[PDB]
Symmetry: C2
Subunit: 139 residues, 2 copies
């Protein structure tokens, strides 16, 4: 389950500095632990936007300890994060991925943008074009 | 931990065309005039069988392990997510009305959430699974 561990460091001027061991550019702040953790979510989603825009691999979460603070990624985002990494490892072009799925090139663009709504079934078709299988587990 | 693929056998149908039998789903038994029509009928009949189990307050049975050589009918993630949710709903022993109160939605939105023919966002299925104390997660192999 995709959970990014968060580091809270008391800020000298008050509040909590937010960092991610796995996500080096995600740096933010809140007055309280609760507000810091809500700032943390926005910083992680903004850092993802940059990895998608820059065509760079998104580092996976380090395993949690019992007491860790974490940000949980919802399945909409997690599906794309898995897809982006599988796409970049494949070294195919977006044109080639479109050709394999059998869709216009425009329709593949949404796959690599966290703010366009995309059916999980279209993410699954893309994963299959790259020789990968996406599956669901219920615990 | 695997892809949701129901093993089927395909044989000549005694009254013409081809029959598709599911190891795991007696009610998904189907026929078509051509091999192609029988395999597409088997995809439709599988959904209709899932609805029967739900309407009967019974668990949808999960696939048996495949073989190298087995034919199968693969359920896409949209439908697999709702199959997992419907079983977890039945196991939860709460009413639809109680689920609707936990997620803050009118009852009518639960009716559509549980309809295997209705498109539902994977994030709304995950919110519903959480309201039943369950975690839905994605694996890529
Ligand atoms: Cl979806």
């Amino acid at each position: 389950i995709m959970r990014y561990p968060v580091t809270l460091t008391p800020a000298p001027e008050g509040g909590y500095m937010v960092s991610f061991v796995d996500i080096p550019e995600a740096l933010t702040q809140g007055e309280t632990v609760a507000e810091a953790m809500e700032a943390a979510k926005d910083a992680l989603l903004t850092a993802f936007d940059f990895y998608f825009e820059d065509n760079e691999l998104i580092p996976l979460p380090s395993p949690l300890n019992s007491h860790d603070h974490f940000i949980e990624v919802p399945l909409s985002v997690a599906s794309k994060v898995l897809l982006l990494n599988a796409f970049l490892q494949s070294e195919i072009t977006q044109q080639e991925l479109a050709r394999r799925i059998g869709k216009p090139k425009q329709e593949i663009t949404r796959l690599f943008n966290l703010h366009h709504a995309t059916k999980i079934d279209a993410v699954q078709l893309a994963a299959k074009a790259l020789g990968k299988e996406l599956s669901l587990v219920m615990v």
